[PDB]
Ligand binder design. Structure first.
Ligand SMILES: CC[C@H](C)CN(C[C@@H](O)[C@H](Cc1ccccc1)NC(=O)O[C@H]1CO[C@H]2OCC[C@H]21)S(=O)(=O)c1ccc(OC)cc1
Lengths: 99, 99
C-alpha cells in the first residue's frame, strides 16, 4: 500500500496475543514498543531522542506482523509514549520512502 | 527518488543559503533542526519526544529545499539529537511510505 503523511502513519501490528497500533518510523533505527511483559532473554540498553534517553529491554528474534507482512528481529521494550516500527523491520516488509 | 531503509534516510537540505544534512523522519510531526540562526520573528514553544520535553524556537513560513524539492513551512530550532524533517514538510514535497 501507499501511506500519505497528512496524519501519523499508524498501522496495526501483532506481537503475540497483542494487536497494537504502531508508527512506521523512518527516523527510528530500531523498533521500540510500549511496556509489555515478553518472554525470553533480553539485554539492557539506553536509546536517545528528543528530551533525552530512556532505558529499554532488548529482545532478539521476536516475530511481529505489520499490516499482514511478516517480520522478525530485535524489539526494544520500554517507557516510550508510542509504539515505533523502526528501520530494522521496515526493510523486512519492503517499505520505502518515495517522492 | 525511491529511498530504501537499510541506511538512515539522510538528505542534504538548503536553508538560509546553508547546506545541512537532515533525517527524513516519518515518526516526527514537526521539523526540528539543531541550534542555528534564522532570520525573523520566532515564538518560544515546547515539544515532546521519546525522552521528555525540550524548549524550541518556532520559525514560521521558512523555505527549505529538501533533496531538490521546495518546501515553505514551520521549522523548530532546539536541542534535537539530529536535524529531522517531519511530516509538516514531508507532505509538502510529496513524500509517501510504500510497501
Ligand atoms: C534521533 C532521531 C529521532 C528523534 C529518533 N526518534 C524517532 C522519531 O521519529 C520520534 C518518534 C516519536 C514520536 C512520538 C513520540 C515519541 C517519539 N519522533 C519525534 O521525536 O518527533 C518529535 C518531532 O515531531 C513531534 O512529533 C512526534 C514527537 C515530536 S526516537 O523515537 O527518539 C528513537 C527511536 C528509535 C531509536 O532506536 C535506536 C532511537 C530513537
Amino acid at each position: 500500500p501507499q501511506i500519505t503523511l497528512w496524519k501519523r502513519p499508524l498501522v496495526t501490528i501483532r506481537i503475540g496475543g497483542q494487536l497494537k497500533e504502531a508508527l512506521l518510523d523512518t527516523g527510528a533505527d530500531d523498533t521500540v514498543l510500549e511496556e509489555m511483559n515478553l518472554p525470553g532473554k533480553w539485554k539492557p540498553k539506553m536509546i536517545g531522542g528528543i528530551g533525552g534517553f530512556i532505558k529499554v529491554r532488548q529482545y532478539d528474534q521476536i516475530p511481529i506482523e505489520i499490516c499482514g507482512h511478516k517480520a522478525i528481529g530485535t524489539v526494544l521494550v520500554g517507557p516510550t509514549p508510542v509504539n515505533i516500527i523502526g528501520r530494522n523491520l521496515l526493510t523486512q516488509i519492503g517499505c520505502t520512502l518515495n517522492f
